[PDB]
Amino acid sequence: GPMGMQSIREQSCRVVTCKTCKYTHFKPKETCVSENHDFHWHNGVKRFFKCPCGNRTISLDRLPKKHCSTCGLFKWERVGMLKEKTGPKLGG
Numbered sequence: 001g002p003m004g005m006q007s008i009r010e011q012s013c014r015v016v017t018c019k020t021c022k023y024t025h026f027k028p029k030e031t032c033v034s035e036n037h038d039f040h041w042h043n044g045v046k047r048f049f050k051c052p053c054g055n056r057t058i059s060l061d062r063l064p065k066k067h068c069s070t071c072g073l074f075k076w077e078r079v080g081m082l083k084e085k086t087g088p089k090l091g092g
């Protein structure tokens with residue numbers, strides 16, 4: 001087998017700061033688009049997380065602030081790459 005890996009389990013992607021609410025994320029919220037807030041787009045790097053019940057999330061920070069949507073506690077663990085960036089074209 002080959003040597004390494006030499007890379008780290010993250011990936012670079014385009015991200016956005018809402019100037020009206022002062023948060024940074026991968027996209028504006030549906031409420032931020034509907035109320036039509038101002039935002040600045042730029043590139044960043046993202047971090048992947050898992051909860052012990054099997055629930056999942058992602059942040060631009062080293063840990064998310066939010067409680068679990070499935071069991072209601074706070075037990076997020078940092079996890080690695082999803083083994084693919086995306087599938088075929090889908091949705092609208």
Ligand SMILES: [Zn+2]
Binds near residue numbers: 018020021037
């Ligand atoms: Zn906003």
Ligand SMILES: [Zn+2]
Binds near residue numbers: 070071
């Ligand atoms: Zn959970």
